[PDB]
Amino acid sequence: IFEEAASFRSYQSKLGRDGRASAATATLTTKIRIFVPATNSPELRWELTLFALDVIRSPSAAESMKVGAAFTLISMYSERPGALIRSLLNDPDIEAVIIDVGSMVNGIPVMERRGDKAQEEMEGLMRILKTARDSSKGKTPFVDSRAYGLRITDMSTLVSAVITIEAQIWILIAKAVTAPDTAEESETRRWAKYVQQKRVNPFFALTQQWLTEMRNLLSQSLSVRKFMVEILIEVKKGGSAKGRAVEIISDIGNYVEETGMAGFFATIRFGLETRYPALALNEFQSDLNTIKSLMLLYREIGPRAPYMVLLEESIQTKFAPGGYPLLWSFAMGVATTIDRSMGALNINRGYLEPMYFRLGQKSARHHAGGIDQNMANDQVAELAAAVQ
Amino acid sequence: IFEEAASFRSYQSKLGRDGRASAATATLTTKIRIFVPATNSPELRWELTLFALDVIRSPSAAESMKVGAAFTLISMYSERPGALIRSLLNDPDIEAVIIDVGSMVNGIPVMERRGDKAQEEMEGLMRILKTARDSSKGKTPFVDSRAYGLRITDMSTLVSAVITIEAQIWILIAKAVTAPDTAEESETRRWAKYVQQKRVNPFFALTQQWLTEMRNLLSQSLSVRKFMVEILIEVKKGGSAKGRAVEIISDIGNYVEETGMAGFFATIRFGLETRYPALALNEFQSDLNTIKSLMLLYREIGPRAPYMVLLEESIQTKFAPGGYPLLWSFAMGVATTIDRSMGALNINRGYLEPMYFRLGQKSARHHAGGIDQNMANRLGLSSDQVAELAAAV
Amino acid sequence: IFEEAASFRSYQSKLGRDGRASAATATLTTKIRIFVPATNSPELRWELTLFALDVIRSPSAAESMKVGAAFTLISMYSERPGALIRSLLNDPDIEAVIIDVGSMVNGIPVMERRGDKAQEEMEGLMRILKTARDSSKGKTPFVDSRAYGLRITDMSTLVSAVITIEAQIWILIAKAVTAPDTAEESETRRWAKYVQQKRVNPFFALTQQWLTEMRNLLSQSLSVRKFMVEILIEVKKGGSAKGRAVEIISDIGNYVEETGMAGFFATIRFGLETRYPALALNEFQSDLNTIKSLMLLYREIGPRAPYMVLLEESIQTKFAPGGYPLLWSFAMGVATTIDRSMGALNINRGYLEPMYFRLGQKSARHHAGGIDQNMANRLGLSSDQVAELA
RNA sequence: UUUUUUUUUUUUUUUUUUUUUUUUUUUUUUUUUUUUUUUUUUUUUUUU
């Protein structure tokens, strides 16, 4: 009877989700040059990393080069850097041309072995490096000068350094695409952790100016974020020992997950998991039916789910908290009142519902020790008064 | 209805844990030299141990050599030292070259395996040893100098000594990777135990100077800790004999378990097992869900669990002190009030909720143990003495 | 709900107990020489016992020799002494080479089995014996010197004496590895019993000096204690008749069981079994959950259980009383108050919490000795008078 | 015939304690002793 209606709401939500989109929708693939370390021989590997860091640091380099550079910077981990990119990278927007870096023995620029027209390319590289130095007023990518110069000849030093720079990229990702302004506080907080825990060697700190410029580039460019999120999903999967490098990535993942899906999680954390007396109110019923549909939907979206927001995934829109407004307004009202540090994150959206905002606030604090009825039941007063 | 939400929180927590991880995640492996006991003949075993002690003492050895040295030092236990390392040690960041020492013919150091195209191998060693002596102002590994010169000749003395030094490595692990500063009081307290119980042989006691240098080495090297945790898991398993060597390790283990997962166990010990009427609080329902999801998660992570922190294991993040809600403040508020040993611990965490941390204190201290209250279990005959207990409180 | 948490605590406690340990963990073996009785005729048996008493008494003997001597000393029981050692001895740190010495006509030492590659074996023995005499200032194994001299010629005298010496080894075990100082009072208390009961033959009484030297050897050698505990377990098994020999072992056992697991037993006896009205007190509920996990764990450890501490068996650490602090501090507070003989144990340990201990004391004492909650009903109508008397 | 709104914004490495310490045997009492059986009473009587 009424069961039909509820099932119909769910039917609408899932209708036309299935099947496969017609191939004509596939957009014109954009060609990018991606340098990959040609072997794990430290002289080439260090120089190639420095080249790539400088490409990203340059005021003069074009976006097509800069994406390719960012991909080099966050593939330094691999035993076979080019294989790692090619094998994980699964994105219709971008078509990579992979250059196995090799002997970086053409001075400051990366090696290029095609011949006479590549002599222009090496001089493009030279211009890029010069302009990088000059435009930054002598500050290189790293904060402490000696480190920028320091030639590495052994695997041990190499991995110490590479892991350190990579971790400094992955520091960013967590906030680059949820709000890359306001970003510094959080990214410093995460940096402090990795250094204090001795996972990252602080001599290799990369300069705030460069990191901000790169964070913005990551926010604005999809192709880079696609590769990052591909790797972030792949190494999050369990059932294997890792190298210190992939381990640091995976560890950072536990900050990166759910990020920029705030609303979805806010209704889950506050209101739903809270299981407040408010939930009995008639107004909520429609919203509860909605959330049921949402939870089953979330399941169906599957492996990309922890990073829906970072991937700009459209299905993300369905999960967005604005979708269930009564419960969300109550979920803000509880959260802001009850959980001391939260609620400083700005939930002042236009669709916030005054009744629920006041009722949510009133719910926790107005009742004391669970209000009308404690969840899982003499001495439920004085102590309760002091607590809230 | 509501059951779906709880199951969904659990779903999120386990999502993507499944399958087998894509091969491209393989990290660049670091090539590292492990000298390993070639035969169990006392003069070579003592000399190799002195080499290794000095590698760790040296200002002049590189960290790549020092990790490999630490692996030699804490493999001295074995009947076949090199086999023990090679067969248990299974962590991808490090790729071992194993060199079986032929009782170290040359002098202080290891002998050149095939004869030295460059005999400077032993000189790199000589420099390492000299720099070690010189930088340490002559101070030898042991607290009593006679030990430093011993030149041991018999199995019995050798095992007495090796067991003693190994135990002195394993004393460190317990704190090296949870708080390598503030360590001294605890690590001395554990040393005193093993000596007083006559398990560990005090003639061979190792100097605070040596122990600090090695504690630092442990903190700063992952590769070493990986081998240590591999062995620590392996010997924790039952179903055999234990020899004095493995027994000392296993004994150390009972201090080492759970360590630096403070927050996780604290919610279990304080708040949960405490069974305070306080669970009934509104905020509590969610927090209970988190623990259930967490507890079932912990189970599923399995073998690594007792040492998550030390192994840098990511899932550890979920177990993290910060995330647990009401307990992260309420479980501490109770714990600090009720358990005299607790609270000496540093509880500076940003996740603590002040109001809820005092409610936990109040819940216990309400009657000085909730006297004339609580006592949920009613298996007890009599109702009278609740009041008496409250008066005692 | 809450049930999950309790089950999880239990899961942690049993996690990783399972499986069979990888072979690399096998510890570097010590080679020890054990002289055993090659024959059943006293002439040899008395002389070999004197040799062995002196090996243990020696200031100049190596620890490797001393362990092997102790194994000779506490295998004199057997009809086939070598078989008894070889067949029960099952500990990985130590590998025995056993040569059953017949002649023993050398003097103080044995007679070298196949003849010695060096006659210096016999001279090593001579050094051992000389150093033993000299270092002891001539005070011999026995308390009355005639016994030390007495050459033994008959089975009857032999068994009387061997039983006597063996019992003097087994009196030590009970305290050597729990409290090897403070020892004398207890070991003498047990000696008095065996002699007064005429089970062990006082003609063979062994000197305080000898007994302290052997007690110290037991404390400082693990390999010895392993063999002792192995024998102590093996002969404790029922379904056999026992002769004077096995009977003295089994008798010693009644002091030896539970020993050095003090804390575990005390919480069971005092506080827990006592079922004081305070069990329900919320403060202890997890403690109680803890102890339950402990008890079920203890069961699971099985065969070694009555001697875990003496075996240095790891799992023992978990069982150690510091582990359940609230319950323990209260189990002591009660125990000290209620049981007149207890409390003579030094419990000045870090786990004891004054407030909870004072609760144990007052709750028991002001309770009028656990009158706080009595469990007994159906005996009949309650005596108010009796309650007041208590 | 139909008419509204709908991206995001917080926090998240950690820090305690944890070897043990008692007392353990035995002691009292142990057979029996009393009593016996039987004995009394026991047809009927009015009226129709």
Numbering used by the authors:
A (entry chain I): 4 to 380, 387 to 397
B (entry chain J): 4 to 396
C (entry chain K): 4 to 393
Q: What's in the article?
A:
The NiV RNA genome is encapsidated by the nucleoprotein (N), forming a long helical nucleocapsid assembly. This assembly not only safeguards the viral genome from degradation, but also serves as a template for productive transcription of mRNA and replication of the nascent viral RNA genome by the viral RNA dependent RNA polymerase (RdRp). Each N protein monomer is comprised of two main globular N-terminal and C-terminal Ncore (Nucleocapsid core) domains, with each domain flanked by the N-terminal arm (NT-arm, residues 1–31) and the C-terminal arm (CT-arm, residues 373–398) subdomains. The structure shows that the nucleic acid lies within the charged cleft of the N protein at the interface between the N-terminal Ncore and the C-terminal Ncore domains.
Aside from the common helical assembly, about 35% of N protein particles were found as clam-shaped assemblies which can be further subclassified into two distinct primary conformations, a spiral clam-shaped assembly, and a semi-spiral clam-shaped assembly. The spiral clam-shaped assembly is composed of two N protein spirals stacked face to face, as seen for the Newcastle Diseases virus (NDV) N protein assembly. In contrast, the semi-spiral clam-shaped assembly features one 14-subunit ring and one 13-subunit N protein spiral stacked as shown on S7 Fig. Asymmetric reconstruction of both assemblies leads to 4.3 Å and 5.2 Å resolution maps, respectively. Models for the spiral assemblies were built by rigid-body fitting and real space refinement of the N protein protomer taken from the protein-RNA complex described above. The structure of the N protein monomer within these clam-shaped assemblies remains largely the same as in the spiral assembly, with an overall RMSD of 0.9 Å calculated over Cα atoms. For both assemblies, there is a significant surface area buried at the interface between the two halves of the clam shell, with up to ~670 Å2 of buried area per monomer. Interactions across this interface are mediated by hydrogen bonding and polar interactions made by loop segments A1-H2, A2-H5 and H6-H7 from each opposing protomer. The surface area, buried at the clam-shell interface of each monomer, is about five times larger than seen in the clam-shaped assembly of NDV, where only one protein loop (residues 104–124) is involved in the interaction. This likely creates a closer interaction between the halves of the NiV clam shell as compared to the NDV assembly, similar to that observed in the recently reported clam-shaped assembly of the Sendai virus (SeV). No protein models were fitted into the seam regions, due to the lack of interpretable map features in the CryoEM maps. Since the clam-shaped assembly has not yet been observed during replication in vivo for NiV, it is also possible that the formation of these assemblies were induced by the conditions used during production of recombinant N protein.
